[PDB]
């Protein structure tokens, strides 16, 4: 300095710039210089920091306390800022093809590329001066157990206390992360709500955001995530999707591991034998429900490692070892009930931040598909801060409304959920919502067929069925064809014990629109079958799509008369159509980057169907 504008020491309200590692200081100070915050708060992760921040947010009307529960809070957002916006989510690389495959006829659905020069322009129109009159919070956070060889540290700078509070729950954050980090590498995460003081635009519902300029950007070659304009979930808690899926799946490709949109659960049978399973489902398909399921089969136990992301790597012995990189659950609120997910009900009544759900007059929470009558007198305020009755046509909670809750509070949290070595995965499950044609469960014929099954995933979102390969469609950090190649290469890794791959459909319907399968806790019966198959049991029958359970192989005792023939029906005409549209989709969307072995699997499936 020959003046006094570069050293931001005088503005530090917690911590010290001097005590930070060199590269962390440069990241903080360089962005302070750019964003011009009034204050810099280096988060310590302490309980005192957290409670004081919440009370301050309560002071400014940004959140309100839910008096019915133990330390629970409600945030109601600006209606314009209620979800991840895929259309404003981008990945910057030198070459487009490294990010997305170049489609044959249409526009790509597998990602969104932005040139570095387009990004630099975008960035310049947004970030300079954007934290003016605000505190820049510095969040050191670990994705994964501190000291896990599979864990990765990031630093998030944000002008949102809502993000700070939500990040303390969803990641491991604070001073211990900075001590652990040392001079090591970290992912750089910069976020601003995009509303510098003095405000130029109306503040709606005490929720700062800038919908017109919203942009969620990833720069894997710079190890940067840069996010502007939204304070909501996937756009602002940068550890979760931006880091744990997009950035991380690229690192994974580089380093020979996997970053996947998968729940992890442990399942123990009546003889004390335990297996870990990963599953990738798209939206409205019940990941959290399965990860925390209350099994109906006596003697069986299900325990939760994670409900959204898995980082997985083969060890020296060939075991596929997985960690949950998250520290909490960011679950969809509506449809969560004692019936659908009793273990989540148990988790969320303490130390939980709720967003965009309804509030009852006694200070409780309410949402569509909650299966709880309210006492006479008890009234509801909707997520829009309006008086509400179940006689209205509008939902009382936004469909994408959330709970944000500590993982440690899950009554069935797995005792190895934070083990640094990770848990050994023995099965991988894919699934979606398919009202027709797709059996309750089938098993892939080989690794390559299993990778194909993942690639071909489709789910009901008039109703529309869309592709969501590996449940990773909004999350690929790089070219999807190369992603398939990466999966396929695992078969050629020496010593690798390749997990069995299954596909499930909890959602098949008859001719009248009625679900053919009871689901929920009863899905433990499907899991029992998978457990036996992993153990080599002779419980399968070969079909053109894979192995299905033999007659009588599935434990249906205590269920009524389940229509097994319709549940497991495989029609030639349905599957002819299925294979044709998968072929057209993969050709168009993956094109020149479709690996040979996926083309082969597709040909093979076509051939098997043609013979029935």
The pattern of x and - marking residues 37 through 76 that bind Na ion according to CB under 5 A reads ---------------------------------------x
35 is catalytic: no
> Which entry of Na ion, Mn ion, none binds 49, CB below 5 to 8 A by partner kind?
none
CB neighbours of 598 closer than 8 A, spacing ≥ 6?
A: 448, 451, 452, 455, 484, 488, 586, 590
Shortest gap between Cβ of 364 and Na ion (angstroms)?
18
Nearest distance, CB of residue 208 and Na ion, angstroms: 10
Q: Which does 478 bind (CB under 5 to 8 A by kind): Mn ion, Na ion, none?
A: none
Within a 13 Å sphere around the CA of 505, how many CA atoms are in the beta-carbon half? 26
DSSP secondary structure, 6-26, as one string: S--GGGEEES-TTTS-HHHHH
236 touches 230 (CB < 8 A) = yes
**What tokens were used for 19?**
């005590």
Of the two residues 81 and 308, which places its CB atom closer to Mn ion in the complex? Answer: 308
Among Na ion, Mn ion, none, what binds residue 602 when CB lies within 5 to 8 Å by partner kind? Answer: none
- Check the annotation: does 400 bind a ligand: yes
Which of 108, 238, 94, 106 lies closest to 160 in space, CA to CA? 238
- Inter-residue contact 594 to 587 (CB < 8 Å): yes
Is 284 known as a binding-site position?
yes
206 sits near Na ion (criterion: CB under 5 A): yes
Q: For residue 34, what are its two tokens? A: 């750019």
Catalytic one of 72, 209, 285, 404: 285
| 383 belongs to the binding site for Na ion (CB under 5 A) | no
Shortest spacing between CB 385 and Na ion, in angstroms: 8
> Could you say which of 81, 303, 308, 359 contacts Mn ion (CB under 5 A)?
308
Cis before residue 198, ω within 30 degrees of 0?
yes
What SS3 state is found at 228?
strand
Q: Which of 456, 455, 341, 468 minimizes the C-alpha distance to 405?
A: 341
308 binds, among Mn ion, Na ion, none (CB under 5 to 8 A by kind): Mn ion
Cβ proximity to Mn ion, 308 vs 426, nearer residue: 308
Q: Taking each helix axis as running N to C, give the angle between helix 596-610 and helix 572-590, from 0 to 180 degrees, rounded to the nearest 10.
A: 160
The answer to whether the beta carbons of residues 135 and 159 sit under 8 Å apart is yes
To the question of whether residue 249 is assigned a binding role by annotation, the answer is no
**Using CB under 5 A, which of 14, 205, 337, 400 touches Na ion?**
205
Beta strand spans in 240-291 (E): 258-260, 263-268, 274-280
Residue with tokens 């808690």: 237
Selected range binding Na ion among 206-214, 314-322, 435-443, 543-551, rule: CB under 5 A: 206-214
Q: Is 69 annotated as a binding residue?
A: no
| Stretch of 131-139, 169-177, 306-314, 564-572 contacting Mn ion, by CB under 5 A | 306-314
- Please, are residues 193 and 182 in contact by the beta-carbon 8 Å criterion? no
For position 207 contacting Na ion by CB under 5 A, the verdict is: yes
Residue 233 marked as a ligand binder: yes
Question: Is the CB of 308 or the CB of 468 nearer to Mn ion?
Answer: 308
Q: Name the one range near Na ion by CB under 5 A: 138-146, 203-211, 445-453, 569-577.
A: 203-211
DSSP 152: E
Place of tokens 């009524």: 560
Any known ligand binding at 288?
yes
- Residue positions forming the annotated binding site for GTP: 284-289, 402, 433, 520-523
Active-site positions?
285
Chain positions contacting Na ion, by CB under 5 A: 76, 205-207
- Residue positions forming the annotated binding site for Mn(2+): 241, 261, 308
Chain positions contacting Mn ion, by CB under 5 A: 308
């Amino acid at each position: 300095q020959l003046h006094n504008g570069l050293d931001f020491s005088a503005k530090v309200i917690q911590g010290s710039l001097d005590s930070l590692p060199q590269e962390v200081r440069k990241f903080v100070e360089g962005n302070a210089q750019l964003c011009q915050p009034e204050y810099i708060h280096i988060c310590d992760g302490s309980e005192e920091e957290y409670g004081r921040l919440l009370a301050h947010m309560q002071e400014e009307g940004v959140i309100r306390k839910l008096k019915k529960y133990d330390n629970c809070w409600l945030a109601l957002t600006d209606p314009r800022d209620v979800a991840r916006i895929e259309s404003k989510t981008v990945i910057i690389t030198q070459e487009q093809r490294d990010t997305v495959p170049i489609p044959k006829s249409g526009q790509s659905q597998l990602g969104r590329w932005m040139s570095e020069e387009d990004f630099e322009k975008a960035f310049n129109a947004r970030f300079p001066g954007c934290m003016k009159g605000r505190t820049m919070y510095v969040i050191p956070f670990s994705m994964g157990p501190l000291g896990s060889p599979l864990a990765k540290i990031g630093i998030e700078l944000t002008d949102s206390p809502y993000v700070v509070a939500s990040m303390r729950i969803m990641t491991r954050m604070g001073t211990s992360v900075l001590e652990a980090l040392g001079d090591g590498e970290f992912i750089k995460c910069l976020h601003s709500v995009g509303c510098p003081l003095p405000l130029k635009k109306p503040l709606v519902n005490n929720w700062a955001c800038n919908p017109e300029l919203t942009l969620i950007a990833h720069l894997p070659d710079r190890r940067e995530i840069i996010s502007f304009g939204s304070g909501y979930g996937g756009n602002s808690l940068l550890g979760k999707k931006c880091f744990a899926l997009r950035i991380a799946s690229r690192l994974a490709k580089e380093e020979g591991w996997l970053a996947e949109h998968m729940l992890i659960l442990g399942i123990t049978n009546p003889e004390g034998k335990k297996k870990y399973l990963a599953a990738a489902f798209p939206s409205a398909c019940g990941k959290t429900n399965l990860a925390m399921m209350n099994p109906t089969l006596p003697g069986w136990k299900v325990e939760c490692v994670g409900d959204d992301i898995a980082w997985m790597k083969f060890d020296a012995q060939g075991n596929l070892r997985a960690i949950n990189p998250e520290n909490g659950f960011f679950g969809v609120a509506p449809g969560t009930s004692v019936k659908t997910n009793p273990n989540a009900i148990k988790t969320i009544q303490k130390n939980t931040i709720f967003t965009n759900v309804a509030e009852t007059s006694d200070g409780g929470v309410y949402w569509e598909g909650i299966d709880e009558p309210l006492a006479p007198g008890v009234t509801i305020t909707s997520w829009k801060n309006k008086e509400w009755r179940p006689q209205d046509e509008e939902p009382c909670a936004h469909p994408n409304s959330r709970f944000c809750t500590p993982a440690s509070q899950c009554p069935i949290i797995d005792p190895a959920w934070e083990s640094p070595e990770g848990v050994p995965i023995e099965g991988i499950i894919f699934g979606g919502r398919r009202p027709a044609g797709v059996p309750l469960v089938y098993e892939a014929l080989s690794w390559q067929h299993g990778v194909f099954v993942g690639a071909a995933m489709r789910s009901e979102a008039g109703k529309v069925i869309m592709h969501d390969p590996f449940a990773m469609r909004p999350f690929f950090g790089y070219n999807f064809g190369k992603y398939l190649a990466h999966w396929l290469s695992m078969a050629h890794r020496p010593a690798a014990k390749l997990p069995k791959i299954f596909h499930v459909n909890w959602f098949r319907k008859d001719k009248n629109g009625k679900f053919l399968w009871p689901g929920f806790g009863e899905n433990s019966r499907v899991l029992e079958w998978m457990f036996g198959r992993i153990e080599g049991e002779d419980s399968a029958k070969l079909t053109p799509i894979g192995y299905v359970p033999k007659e009588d192989a599935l434990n249906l005792k205590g269920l009524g008369d389940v229509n097994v023939e319709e549940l497991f029906g495989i029609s030639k005409e349905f599957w002819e159509k299925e294979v044709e549209e998968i072929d057209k989709y993969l050709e168009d969307q993956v094109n020149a980057d479709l690996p040979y072995e996926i083309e082969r699997e597709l040909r093979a499936l076509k051939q098997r169907i043609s013979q029935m």
